[PDB]
Amino acid sequence: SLALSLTADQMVSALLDAEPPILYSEYDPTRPFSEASMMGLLTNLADRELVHMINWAKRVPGFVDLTLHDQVHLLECAWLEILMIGLVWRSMEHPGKLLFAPNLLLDRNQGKCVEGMVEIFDMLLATSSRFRMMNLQGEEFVCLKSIILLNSGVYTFEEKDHIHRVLDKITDTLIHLMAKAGLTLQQQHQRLAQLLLILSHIRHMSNKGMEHLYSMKCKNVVPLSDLLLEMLDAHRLH
Amino acid sequence: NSLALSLTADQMVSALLDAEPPILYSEYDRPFSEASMMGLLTNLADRELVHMINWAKRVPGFVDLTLHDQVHLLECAWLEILMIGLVWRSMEHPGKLLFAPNLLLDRNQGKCVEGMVEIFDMLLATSSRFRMMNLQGEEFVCLKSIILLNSGVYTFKDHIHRVLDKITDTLIHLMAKAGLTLQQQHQRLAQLLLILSHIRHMSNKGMEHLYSMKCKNVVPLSDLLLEMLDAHR
Amino acid sequence: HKILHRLLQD
Amino acid sequence: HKILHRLLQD
Numbered sequence: 054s055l056a057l058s059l060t061a062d063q064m065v066s067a068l069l070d071a072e073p074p075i076l077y078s079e080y081d082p083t084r085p086f087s088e089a090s091m092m093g094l095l096t097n098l099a100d101r102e103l104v105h106m107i108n109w110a111k112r113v114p115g116f117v118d119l120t121l122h123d124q125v126h127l128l129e130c131a132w133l134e135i136l137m138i139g140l141v142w143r144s145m146e147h148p149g150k151l152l153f154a155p156n157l158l159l160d161r162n163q164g165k166c167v168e169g170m171v172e173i174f175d176m177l178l179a180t181s182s183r184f185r186m187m188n189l190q191g192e193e194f195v196c197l198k199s200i201i202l203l204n205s206g207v208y209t210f211e212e213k214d215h216i217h218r219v220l221d222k223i224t225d226t227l228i229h230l231m232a233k234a235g236l237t238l239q240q241q242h243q244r245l246a247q248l249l250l251i252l253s254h255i256r257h258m259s260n261k262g263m264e265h266l267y268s269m270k271c272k273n274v275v276p277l278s279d280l281l282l283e284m285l286d287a288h289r290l291h
Numbered sequence: 292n293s294l295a296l297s298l299t300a301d302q303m304v305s306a307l308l309d310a311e312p313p314i315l316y317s318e319y320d321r322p323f324s325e326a327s328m329m330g331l332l333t334n335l336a337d338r339e340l341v342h343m344i345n346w347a348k349r350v351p352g353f354v355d356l357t358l359h360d361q362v363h364l365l366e367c368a369w370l371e372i373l374m375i376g377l378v379w380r381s382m383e384h385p386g387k388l389l390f391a392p393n394l395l396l397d398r399n400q401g402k403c404v405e406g407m408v409e410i411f412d413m414l415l416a417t418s419s420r421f422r423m424m425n426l427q428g429e430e431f432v433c434l435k436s437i438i439l440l441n442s443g444v445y446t447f448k449d450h451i452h453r454v455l456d457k458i459t460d461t462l463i464h465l466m467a468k469a470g471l472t473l474q475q476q477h478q479r480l481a482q483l484l485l486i487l488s489h490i491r492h493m494s495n496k497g498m499e500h501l502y503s504m505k506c507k508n509v510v511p512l513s514d515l516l517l518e519m520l521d522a523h524r
Numbered sequence: 525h526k527i528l529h530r531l532l533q534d
Numbered sequence: 535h536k537i538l539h540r541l542l543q544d
């Protein structure tokens with residue numbers, strides 16, 4: 054395993070190099086919004102992001118060493134979390150707006166056009182505002198995203214101790230980044246705690262979002278791809 | 292400008308330890324039905340909640356918040372608080388959940404109630420995780436206080452986050468006391484706080500289950516429990 | 525206007 | 535079996 058043989062800098066550059074591209078939406082400024090249309094846009098984007106995410110996870114150090122079965126499980130639990138922290142990250146410098154795509158920038162008012170959406174919009178906007186005041190760096194973001202992929206499903210399965218080992222390495226990397234930025238030890242630990250506590254909120258937003266996705270599936274007016282349905286079924290809501 | 296920030300790490304620890312709620316008992320019993328087990332658990336939850344409120348008021352910095360901010364934090368976190376408490380006292384009972392000293396249940400009994408076994412397994416997994424980490428009581432009370440102040444902080448600021456830093460310092464101070472190196476200190480801190488993500492997940496699953504119990508309308512739910520539940524939608 | 529208010533104030 | 539399974543293989 055080369056994942057535990059990587060330095061902090063080698064960890065950072067690897068994660069940075071593995072970054073998925075910013076995809077565009079099929080958004081038509083001519084077309085008036087409807088519920089079905091806006092949701093259709095968002096579910097379509099998510100489906101396309103998923104393909105890039107799955108191939109991104111392969112390039113996360115340590116993920117390849119897991120069994121296929123364990124890879125499937127981690128991605129099934131964490132996929133909406135990964136999307137969400139990605140959405141929040143690229144929305145950082147657009148206060149009061151979520152940048153789903155470069156051509157798809159939405160405020161909370163447009164989230165109200167979809168019943169039950171607004172609550173999730175506000176939580177995402179608050180997360181994005183929190184990253185802004187912390188001045189979250191790209192190097193820290195990619196660490197947090199990899200932590201989510203490895204940590205979220207680890208309590209729901211010999212192989213775990215390897216996962217926790219990789220997780221410990223990423224923690225080392227975060228601290229290395231903070232010490233590099235001139236922070237004191239007290240500040241390093243405080244910032245580390247601040248960043249990891251965000252993940253609690255990201256889990257919460259995902260759980261809520263998953264429930265919303267389940268409801269969309271039931272009223273059956275918004276087209277959901279087969280992959281998106283399978284990720285949804287993986288959480289087994291009733 | 293208040294008193295929580297002035298405390299030392301040891302004064303923080305002793306305050307939290309002193310504020311700990313008591314271990315409550317369940318009713319003395321006959322094999323459990325779905326309604327009987329849920330009755331005992333909801334009854335227990337209601338009595339634990341009353342002690343949780345007084346416990347919360349004794350967490351340094353919580354009294355400085357407005358009445359409405361205190362309400363928001365507790366409404367958001369109450370099930371999380373119950374769960375880490377349940378998980379904590381279940382540590383020395385592998386494969387079992389110690390709801391009360393006279394209510395020690397395993398996963399087979401979680402199947403007395405539909406949809407309960409998954410929550411049971413998640414709690415059990417969390418408990419053994421704490422066990423394998425050798426979680427200390429001083430670390431536990433820090434984690435529980437953290438859950439209280441953090442879970443609802445993104446659904447409202449500065450005071451709360453300063454108290455959170457204060458507890459992080461206290462957590463690190465505890466690990467430095469135990470003889471852990473700097474690397475082990477921030478590694479363990481990370482390991483502990485990542486558990487809170489799972490605890491959040493368990494609480495969200497548990498909240499949905501409580502909602503469906505309300506809809507079934509067979510298990511008697513107190514008004515307090517009903518209000519705490521309705522705050523999440 | 526809730527039970528939680530009473531418990532926190534007492 | 536499922537799609538995630540296949541995409542993780544290729």
Ligand SMILES: C[C@H]1CCCC(=O)CCC/C=C/c2cc(O)cc(O)c2C(=O)O1
Nearest residue numbers: 095096098099102136137140173262265
């Ligand atoms: C607003 C939130 C509700 C999440 C609940 C939901 O409706 C998911 C289906 C629509 C997808 C939205 C979406 C798509 C992406 O490519 C990235 C994302 O972060 C999201 C997303 O976070 O949706």
Ligand SMILES: C[C@H]1CCCC(=O)CCC/C=C/c2cc(O)cc(O)c2C(=O)O1
Nearest residue numbers: 332333335336339373374377410497500
């Ligand atoms: C099993 C789980 C399902 C959570 C869902 C649920 O049924 C909540 C209502 C019954 C109360 C359970 C309970 C009571 C306590 O005093 C402490 C607890 O940790 C719980 C609890 O964790 O409930």
